[PDB]
Structures are given as structure tokens and as C-alpha cells.
Design a protein around this ligand. Structure first.
Ligand SMILES: [Ca+2]
Ligand SMILES: [Ca+2]
Lengths: 63, 72
């Protein structure tokens, strides 16, 4: 809920950054595919076009 | 791709820095050493040389010796 999401957002931040480093260090990406097969799918959707959409939604506000 | 000098099937950074072999459903997967997952299951941590096909110079590669694909 709001209380957990507002007190410890650094832990979700740590989870996303750790999943990012496991996805893009090329020696061990398949670690993420094996031990967390939906975090791998989340990052794979985010890499195949989600990053472009977040960049567009920021650059529209940038002008 | 990922480099593999000695052509044994393990990448170079895994051979230099650490790796292990886990079996998840009925399929074995060669993964680098994660000290949270692999230390609770009692797995072994291997290191070998990235440029010898067989680090002990015997006729069995490092990949066969760690994955069981060897003369029994
Ligand atoms: Ca190798
Ligand atoms: Ca080797």
C-alpha cells in the first residue's frame, strides 16, 4: 500500500537496478531468464520499446 | 557474442571469476557464482583457466568435468 511504497522505495530501486545490471552485463543475462523468468520478460519488454516510450514521454514535456 | 578463447563452452569471465552448475527442473544450467543462491544449496565454486581447453591438461575439458558429460 502507500505506507510500504513511501517508506522503503530504495529497496524497489535496488531491485530494479540489480535486475538492470543482470540484464545488460552480457556474460550473465541468462541468470535473470532462469531464476526470475518474468523479471526477464519485464526487462525484455522494457528494452524492446519501453525505453523509447519513456524517452518520448519525457521529451514531449522537455520542449 | 560472448568470448570463449579455449572453445570449451564456458565463457572467459566465468572461468576467471567463478562459476557453478545448477539443475532447476530437469535441465542443467551453467551459471556464474551468486553467493546468495548457490551457497544455500551447497554448490561448489569452480575456477579454471580461460585459455586451456582442459586446465589440468588431461583429455577431459572443464565443461565435461563440471557438467557430468564425462566417462563415468
Ligand atoms: Ca572458456
Ligand atoms: Ca578452460
Amino acid at each position: 500500500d502507500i505506507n510500504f511504497i513511501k517508506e522503503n522505495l530504495t529497496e524497489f530501486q535496488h531491485a530494479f537496478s540489480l535486475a538492470f545490471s543482470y540484464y545488460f552485463a552480457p556474460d550473465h543475462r541468462t541468470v535473470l531468464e532462469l531464476y526470475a523468468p518474468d523479471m526477464f520478460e519485464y526487462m525484455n519488454k522494457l528494452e524492446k520499446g519501453g525505453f523509447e516510450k519513456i524517452s518520448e514521454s519525457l521529451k514531449k514535456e522537455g520542449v | 557474442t560472448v568470448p570463449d578463447r579455449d572453445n570449451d563452452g564456458i565463457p572467459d569471465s566465468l572461468e576467471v571469476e567463478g562459476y557453478t552448475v545448477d539443475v532447476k527442473n530437469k535441465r542443467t544450467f551453467l551459471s556464474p557464482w551468486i553467493s546468495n543462491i548457490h551457497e544455500k544449496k551447497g554448490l561448489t565454486k569452480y575456477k579454471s583457466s580461460p585459455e586451456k581447453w582442459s586446465t589440468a591438461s588431461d583429455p577431459y575439458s572443464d565443461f565435461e568435468k563440471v557438467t557430468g558429460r564425462i566417462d563415468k
